[model samples]
Target: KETVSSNSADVVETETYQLTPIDAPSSFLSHSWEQTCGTPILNESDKQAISFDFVAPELKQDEKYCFTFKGITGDHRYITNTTLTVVAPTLEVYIDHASLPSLQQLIHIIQAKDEYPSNQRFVSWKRVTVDADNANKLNIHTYPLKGNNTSPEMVAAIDEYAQSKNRLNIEFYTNTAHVFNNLPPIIQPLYNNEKVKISHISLYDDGSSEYVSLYQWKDTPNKIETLEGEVSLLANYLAGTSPDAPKGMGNRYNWHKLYDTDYYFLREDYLDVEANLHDLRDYLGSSAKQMPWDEFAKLSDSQQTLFLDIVGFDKEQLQQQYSQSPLPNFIFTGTTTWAGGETKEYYAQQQVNVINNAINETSPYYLGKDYDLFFKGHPAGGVINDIILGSFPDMINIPAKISFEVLMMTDMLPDTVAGIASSLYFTIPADKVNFIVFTSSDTITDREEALKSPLVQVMLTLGIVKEKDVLFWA
Candidate 1:
């Protein structure tokens, strides 16, 4: 029999015990003194002969702390010894990638692993670029005509075409070594204007140790904008900024960016990117049995309903809201302007075609009639017309009525951009959204086969994306 007590201070006091054999419970055959306090007992015999004094540590409010007991032997042993768990504060994180449901699942996985707090937001984005370089100047207009290198007419036409398409085409010659040094000065203007945000710059190297290097343009010029040194310049840039810079631009860039022009041959390696499907799966957070797109679509619908409910809206309520809102309106007028005597009507017709084609291809539902009505009927002519009117109300002509100009320049640039934009837009029912575009200049080989890889399959199962949802260009 043992008696245990504690003082008013909640500290343990000395305990007294009397031991007797099972058969002779009432008899004390011998008087033996054993150390039973202030020391840990190693075995059953030690436990019986000794006592331990354990002092509880001070605990913080809403904190989780554990006390463990180990190295004990008995008839039955616990795989995991006794653990004291204290209540703790917790956080919930909602992660998203352009409103995709798989992003939310990714957040859940991260939360599970780290025991993160609630109501936190997290996201991961990948930004790829297609190289547009010029042989002499690393600037935006560096590509020179191979046949008529010095023809001003050709240059003017090329410039006009590039501006119309919102495309930047530059030439990269494989012969120059100091091309990078000469290029930065020309590119500085674009960086300063914020029209171009460089995610990474790949450099090639010959047999020299300087095989590759990367650089990120800084907000300020002449104050170390270029990241080329022993310690990673990209890391310094990211840490120095309010938010962290993009990944793969830091350490990975160190192995890629370069200075010598002759090293342009290294671009060939970029074409040989080995797609690791496992990496995609891990990023997407899909289980082995599920595809990312399917899982994500289901989750997205559920999440949408849940969000709507939380925000005090149901299907009927949403329908009523749309009904009460007036339809968009627009008016079209024709005008003639000429750079080389080309009629303004020609440009206007072209603009209208572009606008209609863009909407048809990009809109998930393709509400052409609804779109036309919205454009031509409302007080401001339509949703897009209203946007243009708000921006340039004075310019109320058919040439200005082409809403697709802004959409192409800012919203939907190409197939890849359009796909991602549509996916993101449909996923989140909101008024405004931002997009980041990525392009690959090199031809893609075995893209279908790559899609069939286990990693890609895993990503699909995780709801990261559908095979068709992701756009590929060669």
Candidate 2:
């Protein structure tokens, strides 16, 4: 059993050719070669120069291989021989993210083996830089943030709130406010000694070093002041639009240590400025902030689930967020309805018919007020965006991507207690969201394959789809 060294990532090596007379040949393609030892990797031959490009095979230290090339040149048959040595390959790998460390552990386990693939003096593993999901995007942090860390929930919240700073005219709520009792002295140095002009605790799950960011509050009832007032809010927000006119806003921002210098700042006093709240309110219609702020105070939104891709929160999570600070009344939000079919092409074809059947069957609920049924394309070209405005000539082409659904829970544009569910009916804590599935046979049991798929099971469990809602169509 041989060993591996530090530079093993670039393990492939080549053998230089001697160009001797006996080596002359039309092509090494016709040559018969054999390795008496090692992994027995093939010799890449250059037909133009009658040479072989050697690629190092998975190898171990203190091992050797003898390769012999033999062929007949017309009547002049001859054979030539050569030998090569295998030693611990120098291995070095890019170590970043959780996966890399996990990988290194796996490799060590394989290497520590008293024997691999049968003490056969051959190394079967050669490695190069393997980057995990976000390897290049994030800087390597040796430790966690001030406390814990995160997978994607907090990341989603961070992304959403950051984006909220841009929407034209909509408000996102996270909680009542992310109040910092007192910045922990241990994390004081990361604040860059900026004199606390309006400091925010990190938005990340903390434990060690890396963190999310920010905090800003200045409502003069409390004697707050700022270099710049709230003009940026009305001017800087990002509310999306509908056909006849404008509608609500969208989340649209983040990375790394500003502690300050740049953060999302929206001033409510834009109405007091040049912003014509009168014209704005009329134009923005129902989407604008209605009702006066008779007793409202400006504070960072603590409930930001509307901007996240969630099914919804359960009773527990909602109650917890409410217990601290407060929950926004927006309730998490849903969409105008656009849609994806990563499932199947045939399934995609059936989706339209199924939806039609659904509407046909449940006309009482779908009874309309300009609601367009939405279904997604199968990931490539055809049906997506192919504007179907064609009776003879007035044709519309393909369409853009679209999104849906939980049927119940607290009411608001955004889910108030819990967050938004990305799935039309996905949510948390094993609760229920109304959904329907349509099939040819019209029964889920008939499609055992689909019933058994992990994707389907998760969808069913998440309330994205319901067996009772399943409909059948020929």
Candidate 3:
């Protein structure tokens, strides 16, 4: 015999429905319901009743969306199930190169990785510039890296794209992630890599001992969170890679030499950039002082000095040499969990803040009409897409999609590359740049920290960007 006592059925006109159990077991207080074709759209325990709003757009007229309700006993020994249909109105949809990707659209690009949300809201986006001859065939990818160059895994992904296609015409937007060491246990959700044009922006400082130090130390991690770490993180990447022979190619850049991205150029040339390693330690904050120099201190003075000579050395002769690399232009994401019915709305504001801070309302590369900017949300995509849609009205919305990177020699295509700290910024080549905008606030640990960042100062010294364009929170 079945556990439940009632066997009645009813149809509800609206989204909410009521059910009466005739002498039903006390353990059958809560029930869950979801469309048969969808996830558990409804889940609640106790009260014997529940309500919900329909999130999926209607499929057709007259016919209701089908779903089923299930109730389980406290012991899990007995349960009852029933079905229902929703009477909803269908919606109109239009698709084009300039249109926003619906929740259904982005979902197909990538699946939700573990520990991330499936409903990350798609907020800001820009159309990928495609090659004229292979616009229809080229693949597109975006890497969210926190380093200066591509890592092995990052290259593997790109390698497949190259191997899979006979003639590759790929458009890559390597979205950069900031280095934050204070994050969670599994922090993949919080970071990423950039396109070939990515860190190439850091090349303008050829005369900079700082720049020399960065490239040299870029591959040496676990020390100062300096250029070394950034470099080591991407030593094998082809993104910012330049040729080896530092003696040739006069001061002028030779366009024909730049290899198309995915070149796998070995940056072994600048591996041991020379500089007073202490200089980089200053920019890394107090944590750098605590680095394990004591281990070296135990070595004989000659050996200790030699150790520093090798890893922490500075490039004293890089000013007149080194590659005059071209800088080219340029994810939702987080690891925390929010538990609540309104968790979606709360993150709605956070996602909006991140998007607004990322793009200046004034940049010429401003995403606007005529381009398709599909948003790939953070790890945990949820109503974030919905709330974002509400926030942007129709310009933005919740999208159910996913996307991932490499730089081999040149830009994703041909373009000027620029940088701000660890970030890579891109703009249309022909358009006049109004100035790249940045934001700050008292909220950051050290209110003055961002301003003093070595990269920020370098950008200032080179006149790469103006200081006024950086807006701080009031």
Candidate 4:
């Protein structure tokens, strides 16, 4: 026979009670309980207890109800009984959203990829009161934490909220892993204390790139560490894809990494960009057409070179017209506000220093007197190139919108390709270009300080450039 023990049989309506075994055997622990006037809640028998809510208000007052707690031991049926005496005045407990069972505090961290105005390092953080159960959609309330960007004040506020919770769930999107250093202490909590559930949702597939703060070689395994039980949406989605193009696109961009996120998503009607490129004809000033790279790769080198020649890409003529010097190099310049906290002047002067260091004879990065350099304005429109030209009159400005990949493919590549960190570096086949000829640092700047920049550091991490490539101003 099994002896089941619990609180007094006298129970108030809407009360919850735990029924446990009284010196019961291990086999008898799996026994069941039957209630007449209350609702069965859960069976956590591993804890050696069965819990039930006394939802007995509907029953008649002053009545005693029978509940059977039973177990079969040694092939004989063993049972016990508890007479639940209902109290006269009914007691009711209300459960609001805050008091809901399995409710958890969720902190969602948002980081922008590369847009202005809304592209603060840590764009916004939302504190949500969520139900762990019920399909995870029961959000009682959400508060947008008061603070702009990754300021000290914002970090303080987030930390304060985190400190109040015994358990917290942090969710983030895209490549915001760099924000790990500044997160609240609970992020890397001691096991004995607060239980922190960290989850990651990559909205895009380039989570393995340097933008995700990890230096990964192309086609190699991504060596970044996420939380122990992190959820990766991008990882899961990429695994399900067929063919290599979309997968490679997913790898390269993860859908363009918030570059023109607002513009492309502004309309609900989707545009077929590939078809749009295919629609282009050379006669109508729109001289753009989609290239079938898959088919083109099948051609021999001679066939490829001849095809490009037929398309008016005369590499020898370009070299003659663009540079008088024997060894020509291309310098890619854009806005210097990449790392943030840099002024317009700081941006221009940094580019100017790179050019100066390249031409200076005493500098280690010095190109010979016969070296010619070419540059173009950033599409975003800036006086950066103008400032560069004022310092060096000989540098040629190529106003045409020619891609570096095209330059590489057409045999029109310069002796050296130097630039701040850009998507262009990613587009060029890693095997096609020499990393040693790629430059980013300056002569006067310390390597540590140079690496403080997002572009330069990424270049170093990608093996796109070396410490020597970091140019220093003379």
Per-candidate TM-scores read 0.24, 0.21, 0.24, 0.33
Give the alpha carbon lDDT tens digit for every residue of 1-474 in model 3.
345432323232233444433344544545654445433554454233533444432322223334444566655433333334433211111111211121112222222211122211111122222233221221223332223333444444544433442222222211111111111101122113211121111011112332434544444544443333343233322233432221111111111123122211112112123244344334332212111112333445554333223222222221111222222222222212232334555656655654454445565433222221223343255566656545543232112332111111011212222212122221112231223323333322232665565544544544445564332221
lDDT of 4: 0.38
Per-residue lDDT tens digits for candidate 1, residues 192-289, read 33222232222222211111221121122422223244224433343343233323322322323322112222122211232322232232121112
Instruction: Choose 1 or 4, whichever is better by lDDT.
Output: 4
Q: Candidate 1: what lDDT?
A: 0.27
**Number of clashing residue pairs in every model?**
35, 69, 41, 11
Q: lDDT per prediction?
A: 0.27, 0.27, 0.30, 0.38
TM-score for candidate 2, residues paired by index: 0.21
Which regions of candidate 2 deviate over 4 angstroms? 1-349, 362-382, 385-433, 436-446, 458-465, 470-474
Query: Residue 419 of model 2: what lDDT?
Result: 15
Clash count, candidate 1 = 35
lDDT assessment of candidate 3:
0.30
**What tens-digit string does per-residue lDDT give for candidate 4 at 166-186?**
433343332222222222222
> Which portions of model 1 miss their true places by more than 4 Å?
1-248, 251-304, 307-474
Q: Look at candidate 4 and tell me the lDDT of residue 192.
A: 32
